[PDB]
């Protein structure tokens, strides 16, 4: 699972859950397909090292990278463009793991996946491994610390008697997510209790309907609207505008929280600034 590195000493020998690579120190031509780790490059002052980004899925908080060469999207990866750039490192997360062999023929390929069962330790390991490549451990540790302090401030205000349900909307369908899922940080790190701790985890979640939401009667509903990312016309607010949901504590107290999908769905959890924004977004919704 974790990334491990030995100094060798114009490069590191690096092992991660997908394989092994010789990575040069201070790489100067990096193609990044994980949006969180791209934000981390910004935070570490490594902008000039980046030579390709998935411009098709570039969110509002990463527009300083809008003039970098495009390598397509996080799903629609453009291999010819990657190859034409002649990168010295490619950095990927779980969306691209199915392209690993093809990517690794072009250049050493680092996997920075987030472990849903161990979010914080994977986050730390991803960030510190990237910073090791550049001799920036001290800086990265200080910014990791600030994240921990933000986490403690958020936890401080959580009402231990209330419960939340996490849902994803897509076209007209609703699915639910719980602890240890792709959104589990809400329960697992920030301390917010779940209406159902036993939701089977899966990439796009457990299928449910409004009767189920009413039955659980959450105090907070956290909504990730995938429609926004795919450019469908439907919106979670429409799907949830019905009599079953309306009866819930969440609806009555206006605690149906539409989380920014450019952070939560595109999944920029590896970012030293973007993870802080997510933590703030939760905190401010429940304080
Ligand atoms: O519509 C998309 N993908 C297809 C096909 O998706 C996949 O290849 C698989 C599911 O078949 N998805 C992933 O592997 C995946 C992995 C991590 C996080 C994800 O959101 C994922 O979708 C689908 O859901 O049918 C899509 C477009 C942009 C961003 C996404 O996250 C998407 O899921
Ligand atoms: Fe997806």
């Amino acid at each position: 699972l974790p990334i491990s590195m030995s100094d060798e000493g114009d490069s590191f020998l690096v092992k991660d859950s997908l394989g092994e690579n010789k990575i040069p120190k201070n790489p100067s031509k990096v193609v990044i397909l994980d949006l969180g780790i791209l934000d981390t490059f910004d935070a570490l002052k490594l902008n000039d090292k980046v030579v390709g980004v998935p411009a098709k899925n570039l969110p509002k908080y990463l527009q300083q990278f809008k003039n970098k060469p495009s390598v397509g999207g996080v799903q629609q990866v453009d291999f010819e463009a990657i190859n034409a750039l002649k990168p010295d490192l490619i950095i990927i997360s779980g969306r691209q793991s199915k392209f690993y062999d093809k990517l690794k023929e072009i250049a050493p390929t680092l996997f920075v996946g987030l472990d849903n069962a161990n979010f914080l330790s994977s986050f730390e390991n991803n960030v510190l491994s990237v910073a090791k490549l550049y001799g920036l451990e001290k800086e990265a540790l200080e910014k990791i610390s600030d994240i921990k302090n933000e986490i403690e401030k958020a936890k401080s205000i959580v009402d231990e008697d209330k419960k939340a349900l996490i849902i994803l909307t897509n076209s007209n369908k609703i699915s639910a997510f719980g602890p240890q899922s792709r959104f589990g940080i809400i329960h697992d790190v920030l301390g917010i209790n779940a209406v159902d701790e036993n939701i089977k985890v899966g990439t796009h979640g457990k299928s449910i309907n409004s009767e189920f939401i009413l039955e659980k009667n959450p105090d907070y509903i956290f909504v990730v609207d995938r429609n926004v990312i795919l450019g469908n016309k439907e919106r979670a607010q429409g799907i949830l505008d019905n009599a079953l949901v309306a009866k819930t504590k969440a609806a009555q107290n206006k605690k149906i929280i539409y989380l920014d999908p450019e952070y939560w769905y595109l999944a920029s959890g590896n970012g030293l600034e973007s993870l802080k924004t997510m933590i703030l977004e939760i905190k401010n919704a429940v304080k």
Side-chain angles (χ1 to χ4, degrees), residues 1-7 9-14 16-21 23-55 57-59 61-75 77-79 81-101 103-104 106-131 133-137 139-159 161-171 174-199 201-205 207-214 216-232 234-246 248-287:
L1 258 170
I3 302 169
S4 65
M5 302 172 55
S6 51
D7 191 306
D10 62 319
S11 31
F12 290 87
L13 206 217
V14 184
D16 56 46
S17 57
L18 298 185
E20 292 200 5
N21 295 274
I23 298 178
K25 287 187 182 178
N26 190 34
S28 60
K29 305 207 256 169
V30 189
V31 168
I32 304 178
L33 300 158
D34 187 66
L35 291 176
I37 242 348
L38 179 61
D39 179 69
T40 285
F41 270 65
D42 180 84
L44 293 174
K45 316 304 306 181
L46 299 167
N47 300 242
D48 289 343
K49 309 301 173 172
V50 180
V51 301
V53 303
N57 298 112
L58 202 65
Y61 58 97
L62 283 164
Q63 291 303 113
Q64 78 280 31
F65 294 102
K66 77 174 198 75
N67 297 130
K68 294 300 185 176
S70 180
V71 296
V74 196
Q75 279 313 349
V77 180
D78 187 343
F79 298 101
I82 292 170
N83 223 307
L85 296 163
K86 293 285 186 289
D88 58 357
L89 174 63
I90 302 168
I91 305 180
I92 64 160
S93 79
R95 275 190 186 90
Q96 303 93 23
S97 108
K98 59 176 174 279
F99 306 133
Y100 180 70
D101 291 338
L103 295 161
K104 197 170 170 164
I106 302 165
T109 297
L110 180 64
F111 178 77
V112 293
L114 284 158
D115 185 354
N116 296 337
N118 291 286
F119 173 89
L120 257 201
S121 61
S122 60
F123 161 80
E124 283 190 53
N125 178 57
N126 292 339
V127 168
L128 289 170
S129 305
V130 163
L133 297 174
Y134 295 97
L136 260 15
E137 305 91 339
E139 287 84 350
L141 283 165
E142 293 164 318
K143 283 144 186 300
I144 285 166
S145 162
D146 297 327
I147 291 286
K148 288 177 176 184
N149 287 332
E150 295 294 324
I151 286 171
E152 291 314 305
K153 288 149 74 187
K155 286 174 86 168
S156 215
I157 56 66
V158 170
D159 176 333
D161 300 328
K162 293 184 195 295
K163 299 179 170 162
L165 180 64
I166 310 168
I167 64 168
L168 177 105
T169 55
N170 177 55
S171 98
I174 311 173
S175 59
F177 287 81
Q180 331 269 290
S181 65
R182 68 184 303 176
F183 307 125
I185 297 95
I186 291 166
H187 303 304
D188 305 325
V189 173
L190 299 167
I192 296 167
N193 290 321
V195 295
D196 191 346
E197 308 268 334
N198 315 287
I199 285 170
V201 175
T203 289
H204 298 111
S207 180
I208 60 154
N209 58 20
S210 295
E211 287 84 347
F212 179 97
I213 298 180
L214 179 55
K216 302 288 150 162
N217 196 21
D219 306 279
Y220 312 117
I221 299 178
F222 290 105
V223 182
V224 181
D225 193 354
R226 189 175 184 266
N227 286 309
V228 171
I229 301 308
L230 310 197
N232 299 335
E234 323 74 291
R235 289 312 195 241
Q237 285 87 343
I239 297 159
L240 302 168
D241 180 31
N242 69 65
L244 298 169
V245 173
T248 195
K249 289 190 269 255
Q252 298 218 337
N253 298 128
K254 300 164 211 283
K255 293 298 186 170
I256 299 187
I257 304 299
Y258 300 93
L259 299 173
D260 189 342
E262 290 202 335
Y263 288 87
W264 291 89
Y265 192 74
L266 295 184
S268 59
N270 280 328
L272 289 164
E273 192 61 37
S274 58
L275 174 55
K276 183 190 219 159
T277 305
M278 283 187 267
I279 290 154
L280 293 180
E281 185 176 21
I282 298 306
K283 188 181 69 179
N284 286 326
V286 304
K287 73 205 288 198

